[PDB]
Symmetry: D3
Subunit: 294 residues, 6 copies
């Protein structure tokens, strides 16, 4: 259905796709099946829109922009493609992502699967999968769909939460933990992360083999743990709190305070090969492992 108030010059528009009034569509555009292209928006030539995409009003999809399947583009969303524009002189929005109203997406930017860009955000950097990004400049503030006793279990597979023995007196303070009793392994390595800008997002990975144990020894940080299907986020803000990450648990650490030091104990020596850094690969290697194990 191409409304007669629309100016559509392209022939590669799939079945069930509606283009409404006052839409301009140039000839090189490729739009999939079952899309809705709402009034008063524009789509240039060097563009590919996948299937079931909603593009609400006041949007412009410029040359170099690819919108994969199931993406929602909110009203008055704005894209760009030149970082330094001067008169007379590629961005990808991944499957399922949702871009909120009157957002502004800078050029050459990746928005990840199922991500949620918040109304009005100014997206200056790649958005990871599932991330929720808000503000000017946009910062990751949450993930889509994401203590006071010795050992509690998370909702995420095998992730356990710990409280360590803490003593307070006049001479000072002490907390202690035992490997194999408290923390469920014996490390071969520890490292520390500190001096981390409050905007930064650390981790975004999983380990095939290495077990990890995390303790924020001053200030605070937030830790996201993800098992491929469940996801949960914890504030670590005292030296006597700790989180166990089994191997094949995807982890993020972010929202570090200015004073924050993260101490990590690790079951194995350092190994660049032991990292999975793509969430979709992770999600798939985890099912393989879950299907073999059960």
């Amino acid at each position: 259905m191409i409304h007669k108030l629309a100016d559509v010059q392209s022939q590669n528009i799939g079945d069930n796709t509606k283009v409404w009034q006052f839409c301009v569509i140039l000839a090189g555009a490729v739009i999939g099946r079952n899309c809705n292209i709402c009034a008063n928006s524009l789509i240039e030539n060097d563009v590919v829109i996948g299937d079931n995409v909603t593009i609400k009003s006041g949007v412009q999809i410029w040359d170099g922009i690819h919108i994969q399947d199931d993406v929602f583009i909110g009203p008055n969303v704005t894209f760009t493609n030149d970082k330094q524009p001067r008169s007379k002189i590629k961005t990808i929005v991944k499957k399922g992502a949702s871009i909120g109203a009157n957002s502004t997406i800078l050029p050459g930017i990746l928005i990840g699967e199922n991500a949620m860009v918040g109304a009005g955000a100014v997206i200056t950097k790649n958005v990871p999968d599932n991330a929720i990004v808000i503000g000017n400049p946009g910062r990751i503030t949450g993930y889509v769909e994401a203590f006071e006793l010795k050992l509690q279990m998370s909702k995420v597979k095998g992730v356990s939460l710990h409280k360590f023995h803490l003593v307070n007196d006049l001479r000072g303070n002490l907390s202690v933990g035992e490997f194999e009793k408290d923390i469920p392994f014996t490390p071969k390595r520890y490292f520390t992360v500190f001096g981390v800008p409050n905007k930064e997002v650390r981790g975004e990975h999983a380990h095939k083999e290495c077990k990890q144990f995390l303790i924020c020894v001053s200030g605070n940080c937030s830790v996201l743990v993800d098992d491929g299907e469940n996801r949960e986020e914890y504030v670590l803000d005292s030296i006597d709190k700790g989180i166990y990450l089994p191997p094949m648990t995807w982890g993020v650490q972010y929202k570090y305070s200015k004073d924050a030091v993260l101490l990590v104990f690790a079951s194995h020596y350092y190994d660049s090969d032991d990292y999975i850094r793509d969430y979709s690969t992770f999600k798939q290697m985890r099912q393989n492992l879950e299907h073999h194990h059960h």
Copy 2:
């Protein structure tokens, strides 16, 4: 006047409302009289819009938006998906309104603001996220000092500095015009927070910021003024039926309040329009 170039499907548009070129207005929408609906804008089906409303270009008014009389919607305002924009409010160019939001009578949304929570009557809200930074149409040199707002007075207290320390003193029924029955203290208030937003029916109140600073809006239903309480020798008297707000607390601010009455949750008035009526009713 429905432009040849508009696509207006709704019958229910009132007298002397102009709709300009390339507007789309769906069948359900109801629209009052004397509205100006500028070029390249959209109005969906359950939308009701009062009289004398200005919608500038690039605005999309979705289902579940309600706009009362005398509202100005500036260019490129974005709404989303019940939102209500109350009488005489004006929403600044290219702002973004989150869903389920109420914008109060006479508020002023600044240009580009990302509005994430209800905006009280007469509030000026700016930023991403939007924060109240002032009120529309909104010192302490002397012992006593009367405010333009009915019955509100300002006090500078006796202050002694020396080598041993500092002291300030005030006396009840003398520098402060009543004998209190309660005191309370508010502190650790986040800077983004807005406190109070009520009036008292019977309770007199006296306000001193004993460290840090906070700002105090007092409002008598017609006049409103905003004051900075930034030293312990400064105080503000609120007579009963004075609407008060306090906000922009610094991180270490402690507000001390003395009150004529013991706590009584039924003594509050939390709706500004209600409070407005009750004042017009007394005078």
Copy 3:
């Protein structure tokens, strides 16, 4: 080409200018040659647009907006007319670009060749060459802009020198020293100190006809733009042994001051309000 699907009442459109679908241009509008006015955008009566101007989609140029030659106006940029809505003039000066979905407040001047960031909210004038970003928008740099590693080093900005002073450190506390004529190349008649500057503030924005300056950041840090008309560069003054020499006729800006920063300036001449060139065009011509 005025596209058949536009609606243009203006008779003062320059040659080779294109106006695309669903644009509205009212009768009073004056638009130059070689402009490109893209779909879904509007222009009102009291507007002058120069030549070689690009205006992308979803933009409205309201009454009182004047846009000069070679300006790029990005998609969904929004201009405004009145401060307190329920007659002020904006001018986007030559060569400026205004980034997508920025919002420009009433009565603002946008300097030549400025770069307004995408999404910015611009609530005060933008100088020539500035880059402005954020809500509210803040100057974060200048278009076309480590060291203090040697004692003396010349900038590309004409006459401008960068200096590293003798520094003594021991357990009794630290000393740095500088000598007039010798290390700093004039004898001062005045010194002044700039301090307690908010972090959003831009200072200077001028050049001097006769007055020579030597800047030293004596606690904390600030940034110094020096501009000779052609070239410009930004330096960070973050240490008491680092100094910069500004000859006369050097446009200067100090901004990005830290909370505790104190700038110390040595001058060759007594204070003289007549010696200031505030006007960036006026400056470039000379």
Copy 4:
């Protein structure tokens, strides 16, 4: 008993006083009964020493120094009588003790039953019952001196400690107290004390009629309460803890922190003749009422 190895020239030494070896006592000195003047100590002419005084070795009691009864002066304590000497009276009151190798500046008064810690340099009058240590000496407590419940009596007569209703959340914090219900009177006055240096001792008085209620609204300070027989010290360290001082309670507020702001409710208008500033006087008064 005056040792043969002593050189004692005063005929004014009361009975059962012993003067040990290598002491020097000049003709003018007056010394009471039952004293012990230990070896290697010196006493000059214009000196009155009371009864039952112990003066350990290596002390000199200079012209202008009055030691009253029951005082204990530890070994190697040093007194002075000239404030800027180039080649003023001190009084040590009844029952006070001066710790070993302390140094007392000229013109100084040491109150009854005070305790000067060993090694301290005492540059300012020491009040009755005070414990003073350090160089420079600071009062860090008083001799013989938990805010859990809403209401709680003190050892000190009539003194109450109060825990006030607190509310903590995301919006901020609030505490509230009501007069004649939480605080046992209705104020006519309030005053605030702030910017007190950490060495200052404030108060040191009792009121004849004024009730007072103390809340430390920011930071911390310490409050000594004294009823003439019992005394206790409390730490005021949060806005929700207060302390009631009935009339005729001796009060001191000291050890203020930098940020400390003390708030006081008062039952009466400011009145300078309501003060009692002498501890002995106050004590007799708080005995003559009982």
Copy 5:
């Protein structure tokens, strides 16, 4: 030699001890040999003073004060009264003041004018009012440095500084010579506190101050040295049988300790002289 001008009533005074003018020595007193007790000092009845002691002028040794051998007690030092013991080889600086019932450790150095209100450990240097330990008698650039102190190692860990923050890394059995069974952390220590003051019979320890700073004394019984731990990339290894002290903590300081064994109260040695002897012992094979 008992000077004519002293009043000495004790015959229990060892050979070659000199007692000079204007001293008073009561009869209960015992004084070892070869001492020097200078003019205008006084000694009471329950007092035992060992051999080769020097007591300078203006000093009173009261009842309940024992002084061991080779002590030096400077001029105008003052003791008070409970039992005080000044241990072999200690030296008490001029015009110091010792409170009652105090232990002064062997070879401790009490600074002139100090006011000593707390036991002084062996080898400590103590000064001020109140007296504080500021050092010990006779007390990080490479990946690994060996201490003078037997078996002690200093470690510099891999450090990465960049845009996104900072990272320091350690590996057990490569950087740190053991695998731990326990970590502990110590924080919010007042700047005046002295921590540790023990050796372990078996437990290995590795110390990294993770923020702020503290100082760490290591002592193998003959040799000792103090080091400053002021960044997360510096580490110190303590083999078993190393006497350790952690002090001068900053308000911010967090010490992280890795230990080879589980927590065993019976693995502590808290008496330095016991520790020193046990150590001379093992050197004997």
Copy 6:
């Protein structure tokens, strides 16, 4: 007058010296005229004491201590020998029960406070107190209210500079040969000085100087060989001119303090006069 109850062995005591009881004075000592050595004091062999010295009781003057004319030594003052030669210079006075570490110079007319522990040289006219002793002032030492004011100290002036404060910041400014009465050839800056440091302690033969504390606080002593005063420089708009031949000291620096100094001549080592007695003599020409 040697008291019968004293033990004096030295032959070399000058006329009208009194030695009182229970004093011990060894054979090698030399003491000048008109001294008072109070009871229960001790003086060793290599000691020289000038004229008109008072030594109050409880003091011992050990070998290696020289005390010059007009010195006042208070009761119970203690000196020491072993951590050299102590010199207490003319007119100085040592307060009651102070303690003086070995090898120390006490400057002329200094005033050591009662109970102080003097661990470092004390400059002429310094008042020193505490443990450890710190200089807290100088003997006989609403400023900056007016644009310009003159000090009792010769030719010293106090400046308040033009100060602008508004929304955009603050700015303070001063012009050479107008507010500041000379034209600079050099500037230098002093910072990160520990609060216990005393800096300067010299005069210049030729160099004029001008001081502004552009951040923090700083105290400055100025001294013209006869009058002296101390000023606090605690905002960027206060300034102090030191004409040539002005002894100046700066001390009591706060942690953030930065001292800016304008000098009329280029740096020249030889223009310093670092001895105060030498400055006072030069100053009477």
